[PDB]
Design a protein around this ligand. Structure first.
Ligand code: K
Ligand code: MG
Ligand code: MG
Ligand code: MG
Ligand code: MG
Lengths: 201, 173, 94, 50, 139
RNA sequence: AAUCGUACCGCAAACCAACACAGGUUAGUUAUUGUAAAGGCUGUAUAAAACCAGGAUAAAGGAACUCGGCAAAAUAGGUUAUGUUUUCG
């Protein structure tokens, strides 16, 4: 249930970088009429967050992630915003909000960014060309594009073999061992029964 | 009045490091909104009075930016909802001075000074506060002076919806 | 507490409380609780809790000092405070 | 280094080194028991209890 | 005789309520049965010792039968082998409690969060009704 | 199938140090990519002296300090064509 800003031009996004409130008066009035009149502003707009602040943010991320998976090449943030809104309707308002969602995906390796090549660090810092983003069909354990991921895995694979044989040569176990800890108690048994009941219903 | 010090902002040190100092003042400010009257030491009361006045100013603003700042100060959702809805309408016309401080002697054990901090317009108030808008006699020098210096002086409480907003709604409907 | 106890004693004897003067006061040693506290390098010190007796005598029309203290009322809180009725229109005149 | 910790209690050591069975195993230990009987000490050995 | 006890006072187990022997503060595995406030001398004694935190799937465990088959024939190695088996059994009692405490913490956090959402919804709905009244009163 | 141990403290205010002592004290287990589940714990009232202790920043100069680069600071890490010394590793 998206809500429009007092300018009636876009929807407000659930993040700390949003500086516009949601219009909630029963009647539609221009901003200039009531903003300078001196009346309390809370009578016209809601400056707070919704009760489902965390759940809405998670839903928006899934919409962005699914759209990227349907794409076949990296695209800009502007294209992502237009594509999501066209498919589902006016649910996202700004490109900064989408960028924040993408940063979370990049941190956890759910997406990747293609960066340009620059001759000097200062040119890279001052560059203003938009970036391109892609998505991984499944979560990976390495950063970068699929070509970069393959290179990183190859280095990791070599290191693992190097370490395992060095341990064997120095009279250590090739593979570390642990003990199995029991993590199934009476609480877990009752959770499983609850899960079956919900699934049946 | 509250003394001004040399540190950034001119606040009290409350005998604490800055990190612990901010955690304490936020908690007490939350309790002041919930209960509206608290008894504590003089130094914590002086700091709370000045900090409390600036927290009410954010509530009166009623903007997205103001709410974000307040959301980092208040500790409970119920207290934050009250600040923007109930207290915002209560102090529409009052220009400053939303909190009062009265000294109450010394404690028993360590003989520390104490005081009481309270809001200045409500049921259960210690005293009766002056009206938010001061009435002006019709044949006084004060009325003539205000006309010459501030033609937009406010003499009586204003309605929630001013005539311009009411007229627009009537024309629309 | 000692002052109140002494005055009650005077009234039982038939003296006027409004003419009483503190004529004699002194202290006296009581029984002490002895103790010890350790110090550095194996030395030891004393840890004593003291006790004292107090004696007060009140007499009528005894020689007295002229000291007197000024008295003021406390802060007025409640319906007895009327600072909110002040008229501030006078201070704008000449 | 900090001194003063020359006593490291051990129940088995105390019984074996100063016990009644040890004192009765040698002539000198038997003489020690007699000396303590002559002086009239209420407890003869660290090993004694009722 | 049953294999496991099923009637426990859960207020006592979590720690909100005192036990039948208040002097004992941390019951041992074999002391849980008699510290239960719902102890009764008419109930048959279980054939095995389990804490209240054990799952109902432990009734099919037979640990000493398996130990005998793995028993080394050298007495010196057998003594050490037995010592580690007893260590394994004792530790299993406190793995169940740790899982019990972590599992309940997650359920509590979910329920507390759900209540927080409902309270905010009611407050916002109440304010909206008040706001509507102001506009209607002003016509 | 009898007999003895089962409470409470146990990196500690309960054990060894005369103390509620910044010291000493064995083994077994647990969460955590850049962090970290469970569990556990909690400080008389203020501040805009000198001076002392432990930190931070500092113009221009850069060992001129001092018995002595004491203390403090410092790209500290990895791969190198070539050269030197070897007991040839
Ligand atoms: K302010
Ligand atoms: Mg000593
Ligand atoms: Mg025990
Ligand atoms: Mg410098
Ligand atoms: Mg020199």
């Amino acid at each position: 249930r998206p809500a429009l800003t007092p300018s009636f031009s876009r929807v407000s996004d659930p993040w700390t970088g949003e500086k516009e409130a949601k219009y909630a008066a029963p009647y539609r009035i221009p901003e200039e009429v009531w903003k300078n009149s001196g009346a309390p502003k809370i009578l016209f707009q809601d400056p707070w967050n919704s009760p489902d602040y965390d759940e809405v943010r998670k839903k928006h991320a899934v919409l962005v992630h699914d759209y990227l998976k349907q794409q076949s090449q990296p695209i800009n943030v502007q294209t992502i915003l237009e594509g999501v809104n066209k498919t589902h309707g006016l649910v996202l308002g700004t490109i900064e909000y989408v960028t924040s969602l993408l940063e979370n995906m990049l941190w956890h390796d759910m997406a990747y960014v293609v960066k340009p090549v620059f001759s000097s660090p200062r040119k890279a810092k001052l560059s203003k060309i938009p970036l391109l983003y892609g998505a991984n069909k499944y979560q990976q354990v390495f950063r970068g594009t699929p070509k970069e991921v393959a290179e990183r895995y190859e280095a990791a694979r070599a290191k693992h073999i190097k370490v395992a044989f060095t341990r064997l040569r120095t009279s250590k176990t090739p593979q570390p061992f642990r003990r199995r800890t029991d993590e199934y108690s009476h609480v877990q048994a009752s959770q499983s029964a609850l899960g079956l009941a919900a699934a049946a219903a | 009045t509250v003394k001004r010090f040399l540190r950034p902002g001119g606040w009290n040190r409350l005998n604490r490091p800055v990190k612990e100092r901010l955690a304490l003042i936020k908690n007490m400010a939350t309790q002041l909104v919930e209960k509206e009257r608290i008894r504590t030491t003089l130094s914590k009361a002086k700091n709370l009075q000045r900090y409390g006045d600036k927290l009410i100013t954010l509530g009166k603003a009623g903007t997205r930016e103001s709410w974000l700042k307040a959301n980092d100060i208040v500790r409970t959702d119920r207290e934050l909802h009250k600040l923007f809805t109930t207290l915002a309408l209560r102090y529409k016309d009052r220009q400053g001075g939303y909190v009062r401080l009265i000294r109450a002697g010394f404690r028993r054990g360590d003989a520390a000074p104490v005081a009481i901090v309270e809001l200045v317009d409500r049921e259960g108030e210690l005293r009766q506060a002056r009206p938010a808008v001061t009435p002006v006699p019709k044949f006084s020098v004060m009325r003539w002076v205000k006309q010459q210096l501030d033609p937009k002086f406010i003499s009586e409480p204003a309605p929630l919806l001013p005539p311009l907003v009411r007229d627009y709604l009537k024309e629309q409907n | 507490e000692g002052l109140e106890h002494a005055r009650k004693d005077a009234e039982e004897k038939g003296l006027d409380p409004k003419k009483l003067v503190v004529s004699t006061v002194y202290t006296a040693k009581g029984k002490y609780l002895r103790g010890f506290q350790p110090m550095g390098k194996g030395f030891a010190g004393r840890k004593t809790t003291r006790k004292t007796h107090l004696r007060i005598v009140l007499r009528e029309n005894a020689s007295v000092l002229p000291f007197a203290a000024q008295v003021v009322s406390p802060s007025r809180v409640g319906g007895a405070s009327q600072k909110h009725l002040r008229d501030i229109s006078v201070r704008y005149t000449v | 280094m900090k001194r003063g910790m020359t006593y490291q209690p051990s129940r088995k050591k105390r019984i074996n080194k100063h016990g009644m069975e040890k004192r009765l195993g040698t002539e000198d230990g038997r003489l020690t028991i007699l000396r303590r009987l002559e002086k009239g000490r209420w407890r003869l050995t660290v090993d004694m209890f009722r | 005789r049953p294999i496991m006890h099923k009637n426990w006072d859960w207020e006592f187990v979590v720690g909100a309520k005192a036990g039948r022997k208040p002097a004992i503060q941390r019951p041992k595995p074999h002391q849980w049965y008699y510290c239960n406030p719902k102890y009764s001398a008419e109930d048959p004694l279980p054939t095995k010792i389990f804490p209240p935190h054990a799952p109902p799937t432990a009734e099919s465990l037979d640990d000493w039968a398996k130990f005998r088959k793995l028993c080394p024939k050298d007495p010196v190695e057998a003594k050490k082998f037995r010592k580690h088996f007893v260590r394994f059994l004792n530790q299993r009692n406190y793995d169940w409690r740790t899982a019990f405490e972590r599992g309940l913490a997650k359920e509590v956090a979910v329920a507390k969060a759900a209540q927080r959402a409902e309270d905010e919804t009611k407050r916002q709905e109440a304010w909206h009704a008040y706001r509507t009244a102001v506009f209607e009163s002003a016509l």
